[PDB]
Amino acid sequence: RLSAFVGAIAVGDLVKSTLGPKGMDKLLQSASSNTCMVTNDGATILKSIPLDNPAAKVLVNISKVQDDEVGDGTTSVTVLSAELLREAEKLIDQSKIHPQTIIEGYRLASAAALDALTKAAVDNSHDKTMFREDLIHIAKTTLSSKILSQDKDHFAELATNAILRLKGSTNLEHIQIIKILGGKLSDSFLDEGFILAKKFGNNQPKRIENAKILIANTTLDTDKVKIFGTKFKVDSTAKLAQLEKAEREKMKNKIAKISKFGINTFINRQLIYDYPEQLFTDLGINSIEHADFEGVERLALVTGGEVVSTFDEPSKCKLGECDVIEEIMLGEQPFLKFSGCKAGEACTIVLRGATDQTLDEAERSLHDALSVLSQTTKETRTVLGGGCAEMVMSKAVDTEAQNIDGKKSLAVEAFARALRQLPTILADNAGFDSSELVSKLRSSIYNGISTSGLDLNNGTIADMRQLGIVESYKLKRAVVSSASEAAEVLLRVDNIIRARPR
Amino acid sequence: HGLEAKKSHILAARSVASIIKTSLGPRGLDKILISPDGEITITNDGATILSQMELDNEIAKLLVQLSKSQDDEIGDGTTGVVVLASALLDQALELIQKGIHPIKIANGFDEAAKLAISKLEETCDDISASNDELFRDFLLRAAKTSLGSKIVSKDHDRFAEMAVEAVINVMDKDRKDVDFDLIKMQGRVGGSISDSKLINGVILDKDFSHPQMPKCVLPKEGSDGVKLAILTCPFEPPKPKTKHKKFKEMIDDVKKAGADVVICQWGFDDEANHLLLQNDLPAVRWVGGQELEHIAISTNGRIVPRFQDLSKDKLGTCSRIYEQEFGTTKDRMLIIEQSKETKTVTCFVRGSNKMIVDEAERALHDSLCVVRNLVKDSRVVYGGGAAEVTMSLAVSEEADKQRGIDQYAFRGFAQALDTIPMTLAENSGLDPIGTLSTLKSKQLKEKISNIGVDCLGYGSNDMKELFVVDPFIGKKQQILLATQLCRMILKIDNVIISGKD
Amino acid sequence: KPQEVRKANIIAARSVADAIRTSLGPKGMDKMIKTSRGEIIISNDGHTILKQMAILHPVARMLVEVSAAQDSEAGDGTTSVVILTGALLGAAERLLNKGIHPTIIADSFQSAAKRSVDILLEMCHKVSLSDREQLVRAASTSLSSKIVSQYSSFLAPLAVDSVLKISDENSKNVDLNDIRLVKKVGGTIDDTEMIDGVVLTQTAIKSAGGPTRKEKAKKCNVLLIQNDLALHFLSKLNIMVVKDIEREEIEFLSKGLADLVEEIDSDGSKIVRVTGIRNNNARPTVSVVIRGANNMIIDETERSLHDALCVIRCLVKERGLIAGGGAPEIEISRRLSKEARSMEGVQAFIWQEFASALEVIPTTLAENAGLNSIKVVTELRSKHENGELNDNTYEEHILQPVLVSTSAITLASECVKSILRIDDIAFSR
Amino acid sequence: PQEVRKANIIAARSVADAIRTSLGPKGMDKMIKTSRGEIIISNDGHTILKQMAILHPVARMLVEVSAAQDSEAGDGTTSVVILTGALLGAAERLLNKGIHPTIIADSFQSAAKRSVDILLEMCHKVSLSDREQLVRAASTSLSSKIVSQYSSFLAPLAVDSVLKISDENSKNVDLNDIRLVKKVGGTIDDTEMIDGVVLTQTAIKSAGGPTRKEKAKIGLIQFQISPPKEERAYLLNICKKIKKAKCNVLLIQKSILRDAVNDLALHFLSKLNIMVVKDIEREEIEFLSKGLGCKPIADIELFTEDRLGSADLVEEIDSDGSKIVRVTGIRNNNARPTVSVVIRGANNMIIDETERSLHDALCVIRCLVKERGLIAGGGAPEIEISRRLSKEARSMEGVQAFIWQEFASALEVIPTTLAENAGLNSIKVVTELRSKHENGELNTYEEHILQPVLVSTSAITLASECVKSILRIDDIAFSR
């Protein structure tokens, strides 16, 4: 435990004093001593120095993951992870708390830390009239070499409304893409009705009002799909069908749990036999088939459902709903257009091509076009820096530290101390007193004045909005996510296995 | 000697066993291991961790020999048997100081192990005899517990069904014969896990050579399956063995039969592949030794050695052959499935990093071993520590009714079973002594049931509501190997270590 | 390392208990101890071993105070109480490795000791002091460990009739220090005089003028002294004088303490007897007179009759008797093992280890007798299941009083507690 | 982290104090004995620190500071080391007071910028149009060299060379375009400017070589005239392709691999009157590509007419043991008219020290190009700064207020060393300078002792960043 905690601090001490523009520098010296150099880069110092500590090699792969996202903030990841391991010494002797319970306390603290930074985050998106107009011009530049360059106005307009109308996560998991044949690309339009290829039902109506959607995964029709190898021992042919008829009687136990929920719409990945489906007709239950994987997850996001396939207790679950389910037919194929989804946020771009070659090139080019538009949400958006954002996160941790059990009480409280260590180290390299600035900053933000921060030039507390010192919000989440994953493995280590040299 | 080796065998076993006690369970530690072949992966599987341990103590070497044979039967019970067998050695050390010979300890645990099997069967429940529709959910949630500690836990909903169909295809309902040689695990760098699909056939790692060759195979006007040619004789003019220093005859015989693909181990030439391009006959170069000796049984075809006897119905038939592009990888492999049930299923998993592929590869392979034991016995028991507590209370109560010298051998077996729930209680952040006494009080005054140590955070007992089950044949195989290992260690009273030259 | 300092004292304490363990029983192994002064003594009595051992270990000296209280209260079991103390220390070694604080370990011994007494009284047969046939055979068996055998038949009613007069009812603690064993040169074992009033240690005046006898003496007829002219002065006044009174008997006579005062000499004794004190505050103190020729007679007889009074003392304070030889310790370990499931938490596991710690006493008795260690112990749990207190020691006339088995567990709970409660020691002067 | 910095400051202070004794011509010379047995003796600070082979990592930074001191200002390589050690010596008590090095580092950079404006107000503003102060600056700077009477003749030659290439806004001018070619023979009185270009070697001394050609083209060619490795036929096509572009001047790079020009090719070039100059050093390859505006040509196919220069007259001047070839009228509008001066003399020790003397003469004149004006040396600019910082230190506040008092005290080390090396009493001479400071300011003018302002400015600027980078390293680890 000493090499994984104290031994990891010495690795973080090299990047500790090098954080910030006023930070110190380190020396990398070889045997000949004439090849040396002086630089503040944290990734260069760690990779150049050979590490005989087998526990220090874990932090090497952590810096490589951070460098993939963005080339800034690699130093702050090791420094923040070193403060969590430094306080881990007190988490053993005078605490005696299970390490995984301490990690679970960080997940509850990181959830409130990201929500606290979102409300205090600012952006340059103000005067959106100029901002929203430039979004369509950027998408037209990405249309070069792509078949979508034929019409810039109509094709880029669908990509513009596919971003701002989301009001949430910009990941492609909220956007549905459908590839169909027998049409032209100019007829494509934006529709939120969640259009998919397959239909459902035969004699059932195509319109459903006040629908209740529930997501589950089970096989209700002819389980054990492979019959090869079985041996049927029966006294008569009619006695062999008794096992199949006995299974139909047991189907009422699974149907009764569904009927008690009062849902007219069911989701199934596999098929359904006529008898359990005929019982759904009297109850007015329609089952949707061929939901794949994204169709299962994306349906729970727009309707507010759950992805669990089992029922742990009756009359307790997460249920969705939609106002109207409309089924139309276009291109000689039936389509499913949902309407009136509660709090539904998503978009579905239906690409209608004339062949298979135009569908694959349009989908791959749309992902690259939407990636630039979605990047503008995480880019140029900053937060108040200079100790501000570091202290604001400490207030959200203290809120969770109020109501807590006995095991995670010291774990959540220890995370709040590491958050104040970031402005403490930055104030050390600035040449001023860190204990005086961090202490006065907590008492000010405690009651009101959440925009205050630490001024490095004047060595006092000043308004960050007037000084104009801000730090990117994407950098804040990247460091917390990297520190949460790096500390999750290290705290669970009860023994060290030396890696084999290559 | 007697006063020396007998005391040293107990201290040597506690040193190795105490290492894996921290990694036992889903909350344990994932250890970094590097194989000498260059493969790097991170997993908590004890069979890999124990195999990489190199030490000169002859007592701890018996763990690797037992884990090698257990890897074929189960492979996931490596951490369970070593800890359970070490608990029997701790109780055996006290019996030696009381004047009991070590040979009586070996025979004492055998009568206690067989007696506890009949007690667990009485409290055991059956799947098909209770609820048939829950049989699908039992196989889906069984792999979710082992995959909860990995990144696979995000997509686990889709990956749970992939392990169900792979085990059923290689087995028979009545026979229940599953062989690890019929299930292969492969993966490549690039892409994500969401694009992984279950394949009913081999990989072959084929780009179809020149791109002008068709990437998909047509049924050719409603023919029977897809004609494939398995032949050891390629297309090229021959020579004698006394020298060492015809085109239109051989190639026309293959076209009359309709074989689309020809398999030859070594590589081909440029002009040699030009004759096969005009006829739309893809070529196969660099054949690995994995492509023959079993699966063709499911083709229901014939085997023709030479071009003379080739015909339409004597060629192996499959469902179809197509080349699907995977991400940005330039390999452009193929997927060959089959409509009818085959004897071999190869899983295909993709990942963005080489370490991620190997992490999910062994994590999915362990899920196949858990399902293998669930389909072997329809009757399952409640796990999570409830099996060791229930079996211990039956032996401890019946120990007073059995008199003689074996009376104390039965009491030590009941206390040794309590090591497993106390070890999982420490890894879950609970009092191992307080939880052990709590589980015994709830199963006595209230009612007889199976309540184990909590793997996930909760506030009370009765995990039975979560429907967490373990296979009966899997738990029974662990107590038999742990008892046999404890007997085998006592049969060696002297450690002979040869020198070096 | 505060706990490691205490663990060093526990290992040193278990080494002392293992040394006394070999001396348990009449067949036990003797211990040779060479004093610094040059005296060489050997014996199987655990009280004499720990007294002259001169233990310099601070915690190990607690066994000497317990052995002193074991002989002062029960009078028997000074060797077995050391083994039982070391059994709880050995079981507590594995408890410290599990993170158990000794407070719970010490507090659970209080509930375990009180429960063991209630269980022992259920199988014990309650007896009364009004039956004189049971007390004769009880004290006669304790005299079978000495050279005197055929002459011990007359010594049984001597100790029984002395206690029954002072027993009365609800006497609780009965001090045996008031009963003095008089050792004089000459006579035999069969010659004994009770003299229930009191018995002195000294003779009378052998000079001229001494009356040596007086009727209705206390106007001081008889006086005691802790000159030859002073004897002649008081001779005319008819005042008996007894000088040279031992300083040790000064405190003795101030507690127990005349119608007739006379000097009766069987052979050579020249001893004065007093009868009929009839004091309201003072009780009827009886001093036993022992006569013998050789010095080894009155010596070995003194320690034999002293242990017989302790066995009777146990029956007066606590009624009932049980069969010795570790018979009740087997059933107690069986009942506490099944009742351990009724508890919950860390204390429930202590009941299981406490039952195994009680089996060391019957195991040692089988080891020191030459019988197989583990084989005899297995036969105890087998026979005690169907029968109750039937194993046969009753036919062999082996009777151990219940107060000895009760005090052995009670003193062991306080002895082990005082050990684990010491977390450190430093120089204090 | 103080144990690492204090160990580096003490190690650097002993090196700075050792070089401090070498300040001035009367200073104490330091001896260095190499492992090979070579012993050098001189007062140059850059030469001592280069051959000392210092194993201390931070102490090696003084070599880079002394390199930039001679490259920019050209003087004060010893004085910049003394000022660097003066700030490190005063920083020993700063760490004992609990002062963080960031305030120490930020105060040196802020004081260095304010010290420049103080010197500019006290400096006398001069212009480059007046040749009176330009000749007297280079003439008095040569009083430390063997040349005395001939120093007055070389003064106007160096002035007219810089003023042509200085222009106005050009500011820094590359010194690599000025090549001093030394050769045995001749004398100092005979000099030729030759603004076109000057080579480092002679011409072909064999028979048949014209050695002189008028209206020829000059270009860089990396090819070489050699037999196949029949012979006259292979050499005919080589000279035929050169005649296509009418290139009468062939410059072959010196290489020990093969020869330069075959004897058979000399007879072919004699008819066409094509002059060839061999033994061209590798350092002159980049030099000829600048002033002549040509490009190096590796192969015969890369040879073109557009890459060839122009030469009005190429002739071999007759001189004793010299025979220097000159080129005039390069006629290149893109390339600037640089100056290459030829140095001649009978003794080898003459042309050697003469080349080094002209280096410091051109740097002092170049200092006036970047910033005009000059300040007399001898401790005047060092003490004058401390006079203004006395009352200014009282106007500050906080930790920085104490640094201004210690910064002026460290500047007094330079004038103190000048008094010690001259045998005079250290403190006694310094007190006499501050006593008359109430009346006189710059008064050294009658002794014809002048120093440029860039030397005093760069000495403070380089020493400010040097000491700043020293305190930045708090740890030294092994990295390989």
From Swiss-Prot, chain A:
Belongs to the TCP-1 chaperonin family. Keywords: Acetylation, ATP-binding, Chaperone, Cytoplasm, Nucleotide-binding. Molecular chaperone; assists the folding of proteins upon ATP hydrolysis. Known to play a role, in vitro, in the folding of actin and tubulin. In yeast may play a role in mitotic spindle formation. Heterooligomeric complex of about 850 to 900 kDa that forms two stacked rings, 12 to 16 nm in diameter. Interacts with PLP2; this interaction leads to inhibition of CCT complex mediated actin folding. GO terms for cellular component: chaperonin-containing T-complex; cytoplasm. GO terms for molecular function: ATP binding; ATP hydrolysis activity; ATP-dependent protein folding chaperone; unfolded protein binding. CDD domains: TCP1_beta. Pfam families: Cpn60_TCP1. The gene is CCT2. The keyword Nucleus does not apply. The lineage of its organism: Eukaryota, Fungi, Dikarya, Ascomycota, Saccharomycotina. It comes from Saccharomyces cerevisiae (strain ATCC 204508 / S288c) (Baker's yeast). The keyword Acetylation applies. It comes from the Eukaryota. It is found in: Cytoplasm. Disulfide bonds: none annotated. This is T-complex protein 1 subunit beta.
UniProtKB/Swiss-Prot annotation, chain B:
One of its GO terms (molecular function) is unfolded protein binding. GO terms for biological process: chaperone mediated protein folding independent of cofactor; protein folding. It comes from the Eukaryota. It holds the Pfam family Cpn60_TCP1. Coiled coil: none annotated. Keywords: ATP-binding, Chaperone, Cytoplasm, Nucleotide-binding. Heterooligomeric complex of about 850 to 900 kDa that forms two stacked rings, 12 to 16 nm in diameter. PANTHER family: CHAPERONIN. This is T-complex protein 1 subunit epsilon. It comes from Saccharomyces cerevisiae (strain ATCC 204508 / S288c) (Baker's yeast). The gene is CCT5.
From Swiss-Prot, chain C:
One of its GO terms (molecular function) is ATP binding. Disulfide bonds: none annotated. InterPro entries: Chap_CCT_delta, Chaperone_TCP-1, Chaperonin_TCP-1_CS, Cpn60/GroEL/TCP-1, GroEL-like_apical_dom_sf, GROEL-like_equatorial_sf, TCP-1-like_intermed_sf, TCP-1_chaperonin. Keywords: ATP-binding, Chaperone, Cytoplasm, Nucleotide-binding. One of its GO terms (biological process) is chaperone mediated protein folding independent of cofactor. It is found in: Cytoplasm. The keyword Chaperone applies. GO terms for cellular component: chaperonin-containing T-complex. Belongs to the TCP-1 chaperonin family. Present with 5530 molecules/cell in log phase SD medium. NCBIfam families: chap_CCT_delta, thermosome_alpha, thermosome_beta. Heterooligomeric complex of about 850 to 900 kDa that forms two stacked rings, 12 to 16 nm in diameter. Molecular chaperone; assists the folding of proteins upon ATP hydrolysis. Known to play a role, in vitro, in the folding of actin and tubulin. In yeast may play a role in mitotic spindle formation. This is T-complex protein 1 subunit delta. It comes from Saccharomyces cerevisiae (strain ATCC 204508 / S288c) (Baker's yeast). The lineage of its organism: Eukaryota, Fungi, Dikarya, Ascomycota, Saccharomycotina. The gene is CCT4.
Curated annotation (Swiss-Prot), chain D:
It comes from the Eukaryota. It holds the Pfam family Cpn60_TCP1. CDD domains: TCP1_delta. Keywords: ATP-binding, Chaperone, Cytoplasm, Nucleotide-binding. InterPro entries: Chap_CCT_delta, Chaperone_TCP-1, Chaperonin_TCP-1_CS, Cpn60/GroEL/TCP-1, GroEL-like_apical_dom_sf, GROEL-like_equatorial_sf, TCP-1-like_intermed_sf, TCP-1_chaperonin. It is found in: Cytoplasm. The keyword Transmembrane helix does not apply. GO terms for biological process: chaperone mediated protein folding independent of cofactor; protein folding. One of its GO terms (molecular function) is ATP binding. GO terms for cellular component: chaperonin-containing T-complex. Its main location: cytoplasm. Belongs to the TCP-1 chaperonin family. Molecular chaperone; assists the folding of proteins upon ATP hydrolysis. Known to play a role, in vitro, in the folding of actin and tubulin. In yeast may play a role in mitotic spindle formation. Present with 5530 molecules/cell in log phase SD medium. Heterooligomeric complex of about 850 to 900 kDa that forms two stacked rings, 12 to 16 nm in diameter. This is T-complex protein 1 subunit delta. It comes from Saccharomyces cerevisiae (strain ATCC 204508 / S288c) (Baker's yeast). The gene is CCT4.
